Amino acid sequence: NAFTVTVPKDLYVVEYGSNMTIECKFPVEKQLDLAALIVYWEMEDKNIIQFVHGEEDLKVQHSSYRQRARLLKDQLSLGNAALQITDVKLQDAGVYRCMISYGGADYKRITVKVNAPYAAALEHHHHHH
């Protein structure tokens, strides 16, 4: 089977101010070959995290993500590229792409929607026809 990146789901609904972890899975047969693995997460035109030769390149990460966005590295040997972003903001809503090279290469898109703090209380404020 061709090299395929999978997503557990393609839409995350997250609360403003929470921490979110979004995931892309890739095939790893036995032990992970870190020399081979390249991971890049992007949203809009912003570098969220790139990972190559076993390390994150934080000098290329967009400044809005400093101290906020990382890969859960220990998940990579399980074939899981798990991006955690702390203290989610309204402007974190949008379309994210995970790009993975591990011999073969593929990518997926994930949408994030962010609920503001009073969204639940106001859900039934005023419905319309």
Binding site: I38, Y40, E42, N47, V52, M99, S101, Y107
Partner: peptide, 14 residues
């Protein structure tokens, strides 16, 4: 994103 041809065509940064 700046790595030669890696992911060329898939990203917007740069």
């Amino acid at each position: 994103f700046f790595x030669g041809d890696v992911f060329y065509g898939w990203y917007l940064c740069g």
